[PDB]
Amino acid sequence: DLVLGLDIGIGSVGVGILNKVTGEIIHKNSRIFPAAQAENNLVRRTNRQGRRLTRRKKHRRVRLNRLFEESGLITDFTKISINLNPYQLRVKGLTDELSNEELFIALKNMVKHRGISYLGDYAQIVKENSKQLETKTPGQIQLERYQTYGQLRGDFTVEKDGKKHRLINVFPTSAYRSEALRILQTQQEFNPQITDEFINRYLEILTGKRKYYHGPGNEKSRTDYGRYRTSGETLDNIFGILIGKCTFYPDEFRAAKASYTAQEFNLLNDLNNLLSKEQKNQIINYVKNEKAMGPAKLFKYIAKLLSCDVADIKGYRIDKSGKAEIHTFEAYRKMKTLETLDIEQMDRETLDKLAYVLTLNTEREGIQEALEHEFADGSFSQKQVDELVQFRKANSSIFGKGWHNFSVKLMMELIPELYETSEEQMTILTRLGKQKTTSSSNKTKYIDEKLLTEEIYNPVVAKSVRQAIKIVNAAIKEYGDFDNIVIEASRVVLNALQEHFRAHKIDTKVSVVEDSILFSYQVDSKFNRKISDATIYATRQAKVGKDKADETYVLGKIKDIYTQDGYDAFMKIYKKDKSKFLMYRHDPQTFEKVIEPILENPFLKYKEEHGYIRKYSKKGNGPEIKSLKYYDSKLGNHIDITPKDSNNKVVLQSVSPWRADVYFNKTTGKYEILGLKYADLQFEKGTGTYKISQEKYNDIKKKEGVDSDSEFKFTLYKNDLLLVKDTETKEQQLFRFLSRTMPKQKHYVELKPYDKQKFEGGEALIKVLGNVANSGQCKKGLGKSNISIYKVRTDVLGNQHIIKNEGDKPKLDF
Amino acid sequence: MKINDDIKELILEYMSRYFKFENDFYKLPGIKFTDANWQKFKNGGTDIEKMGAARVNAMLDCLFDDFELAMIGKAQTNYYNDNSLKMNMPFYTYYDMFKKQQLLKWLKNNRDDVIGGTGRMYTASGNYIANAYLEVALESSSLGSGSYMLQMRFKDYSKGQEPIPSGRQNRLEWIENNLENIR
Amino acid sequence: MKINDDIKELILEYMSRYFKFENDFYKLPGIKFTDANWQKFKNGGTDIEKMGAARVNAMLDCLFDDFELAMIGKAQTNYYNDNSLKMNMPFYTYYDMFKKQQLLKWLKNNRDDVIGGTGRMYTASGNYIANAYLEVALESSSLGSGSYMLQMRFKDYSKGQEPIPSGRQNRLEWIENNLENIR
């Protein structure tokens, strides 16, 4: 007989057991984990969906190259010049003849920039862009902007004298379709090699987008994110699988609200809320055969058939403070007005399938394919399909409603029972024994976590509850069975724990209301996280400051000088060193032009007084200034992605670490430390496995200062506990690993405390190790002499297990 | 293999081939030159016959693959005989001709096993160079952990701005077209 | 491959394996020891890391084929990890296991091209040693009018007095019988 007190928090749990007889504190700890939140999954999904757009643009130009080769227009895609004007060529091909190469250039430029296709201030500017499109093409608009304002792409605010109006470069894609059709038609009048199948294939490359319910994939690709599946099944609409299940039969699909059976069930469940069998049949036939009614005519008809005034009518639904409401059919009557197909006599189940097909799909192609693939031996007519898609597009506030929580099986079991008995659906369900609503999974001793995590409120509460469930499982493993469990959505885990202890016949009362404080953390060992930052930098070779030879510096750039932040950046670089600008070393005349409004007056005031700051020339015709480059710092740790025909190194910076491998050698008696990063692993070249090869690992072992006669001690991940001990004074302290910092300095390690999340700076570690830095980060050198290092594995309850050698070779294959 | 001035010319040629700047190759952990001694080594001052065995072997091991070291040995054996080749061209051009015709024999006999990949090379600053060379290997001679027993490296010198495609079919299609562009 | 004390142990073991008397080995044209310096070398006085490159490479080139030098490099890569191996066994035994399992893969995968022959080794007096080793090679990977690229040597430790038979069927049967006799 003990008692388990368990505190559930946002990013931690904390437990303690008490004896209930004497009253001593037997065991206490806290488990710390990151609070599970979905700003990481948003970033993952955003990047997954943007990579597909870059993929599909590249595949559009690949398909255009295959089209121009497969029709015999040009042969080698090496001699094509990249310095012709595409907009002038689009207008010239709109009226005169082009050869093959200029045609390829213009059509390639159009395929690279097609338009939007869904049709506040943005909608106004897009409507203004469409306003000039009834007699002009996009080519003429963009060429007029190019010849007049000297600037085409982006979005910019050229100043007209009357007013300042902002232009933009988005057009509807039907304009691109008309422009390409006219160009290809005049070229078809001149060139005989352009056939009409070529025209239609180009227009399908140009304006061809997948539907939003089709997803990625192909017939032979078999992804698991769209229609074609890895189980060999092709799904007509991807969202169909996503429909929930019935509330009493967990293997049947939920029923559509616009069916016949659901509307019958709803009208009959509202009528029995207020009658004989014949009166109910008469009311159903009346609302089924007459047109243009609401609640008022129906309540007058119930008053007329029962020979009673409309008062003392017991229960009906009401929307707000005003009028009442009741279920009419309202979709059967609006389906009755369809002229091409007859609906009075079809079936019961065809009405259900027709309501399913109209509820799921909104586009005409999905409705057409579902009618062809769900009504086998139905043999519909083409005009019926056109009237059906017109009817679906007509009143979509009625068909786009949702799915009624029952299924057609249960509503066929329940509909002939509430004709005779005057009772409701719940009492018939309790009478019939249809009370099976379980999610059962059987163990024999412990608690299941996938059972308890069946209801999704937030990811954070699910994370905390399953951490607490692992705590409880290991705690009742270690200290036998318990008697009382006091924990801190709440009624959900309460009901689940009561059901678990009542099913296994264990009488236990669960309720929802120092130096030896152990801790245990969650070790982080996933191996494909974000490898670096996402800005691509450019490097130059220079001599800045106290420097004697040419060295590689990383460039930085001030994007807009006029803005306040540009002035702060320019002022800091100006007061530190003036020669750090590239314009100060290639053009000093423009730089004294820059010193003049600094000395007289800041750049915003000059822009209001005279416009943009121009580059100095002998006349007033030079270009203007909006941005400036400078030499930021030297080049350190990077990933070199320099292109093939470049001449300066182009890099990615700030690359993130993954794990460390601790070695020891019996020649000098000191410990040595590897550092692996996320960018050190690789999809291997034959099969595609994600691992680190062995020759590359020996290169990192050479580089990080580890001799080859050293035994391998253990491996360390993030939040993995670590024991550092002195060997002459025998004082010890245990830490949390974080990373291997500063790759220039050998055997430097950043450590985090064992008792809190942050050091906050200043306190005293072991005498050999030193004092924590004044700013807050502890990064110390563990590759010293006279020291010893052990690994600490702690179980979920927090009992230490100190290890010295944990294997024979590092684990590189997963 | 035996060591003379031709090995110095071959080392300098492949060092200029794989590395953008010179300082990377001569500060690696195992070579470890200084600046004055590197200027003496490049100008023919120091003779590569009486240097340290470990330093010369580390310079040879960083630049070449191990099957390529076996091909250095066989090349030297075939080249110091038959002195029209010793009259005509220098040793690195003959080494390139030897390994290129070995690749042609690989592509002729067994075209189902030739796989390829991108090759990342570590410099002396701690960093690596993504896409430093193009590596080619035989799948059937595959030791465990991803090492391969038969393997060669090449450096493509094509002029167009389009990279080498991934996939087995596409990469092996690319190698057969641009044979005289890879060096 | 890289050069350390294990290469000294490997050189001394294979020199004791192939030559009847020691004096023949060092006096070869390219190694060229004296007696006192050889006695200094055998006792570990001089370290083979800062000796001449030509002398160390000639010592390694006389004993091994070039494919065997590539196998030394690959075995070193597999051997300096997995610290049971480093402590438990000296290098040359693991190298022998490496070349034997390479021979087993050669006999299993492609059994149609493995040919063999006897191997004669030259001493320092002008004479050679007839039937010094058994060399095995792959027929398909032989340079035209040149020695086989893929090639290994073995020394049989059988106790009977009967040499290796001629013919191509019988020798390849013989290798499969006396697998645990060749070292």
Place this chain on the structure above:
RNA sequence: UUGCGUUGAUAAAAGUAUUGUUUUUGUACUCUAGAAGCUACAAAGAUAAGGCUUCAUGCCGAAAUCAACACCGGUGUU
């Protein structure tokens, strides 16, 4: 606890558009047809390092899962 109506908050997944950063090339601006590669504009290439087979409305790569080791859903150890 079950069903039906309104309206808020949230989560998972799908289809697109225009930029941004950087490399090469061209025109302008500068210095003597050359050079320098600053400052603008326009094409073409790349856009987490990479990898696959089916040859295309082609596909995958930034989330979660967690103390290890030994013996028939349980049991044993440093």
Place this chain on the structure above:
DNA sequence: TTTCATTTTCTGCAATACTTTTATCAACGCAA
């Protein structure tokens, strides 16, 4: 007294405009 070798510190990091589906919680009413 120049110079190499270890310990602190302090600066900087990718965005925006549309379209659509499914599910789960709440709270506000009619019923058992």
Place this chain on the structure above:
DNA sequence: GCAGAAAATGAAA
């Protein structure tokens, strides 16, 4: 929050 050179500090040569 954290990667990591820059600026500051310390122990030879």
